[PDB]
Amino acid sequence: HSDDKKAFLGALKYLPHAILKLLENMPHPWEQAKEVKVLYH
């Protein structure tokens, strides 16, 4: 999908709730890499 609007209605509708969760889950400096659950469109 790198290179339909009706399907992007809700996806574009809530961007920032994803910014919240992601910025909330930041790997802490004592943790190399963090596996995380993801709900994607």
Partner 1 sequence: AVNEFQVESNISPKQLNNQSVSLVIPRLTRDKIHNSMYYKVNLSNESLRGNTMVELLKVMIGAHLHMMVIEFKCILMKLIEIRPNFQQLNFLLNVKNENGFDSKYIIALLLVYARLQYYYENDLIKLFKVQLYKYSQHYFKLKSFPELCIIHIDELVDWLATQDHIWGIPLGKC
Partner 2 sequence: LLIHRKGLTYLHLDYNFNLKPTKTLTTKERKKSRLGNSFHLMRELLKMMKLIVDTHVQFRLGNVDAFQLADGIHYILNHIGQLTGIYRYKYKVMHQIRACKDLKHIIYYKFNKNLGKGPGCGFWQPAWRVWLNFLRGTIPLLER
Note the residues at the interface with partner 2 (CB under 8 A): 8, 12-17, 19-20, 22-24, 26-27, 29, 33
Please tell me the distance from the alpha carbon of residue 21 to that of residue 25, in angstroms, as a whole number: 6
Considering beta carbons, is residue 16 or 37 the nearer one to partner 2?
16
Considering beta carbons, is residue 6 or 34 the nearer one to partner 1?
6
DSSP the chain: ----HHHHHHHHH-SHHHHHHHHHSPPPTT-S---------
For residues 1-41, which are near partner 1 according to CB under 8 A?
2-3, 5
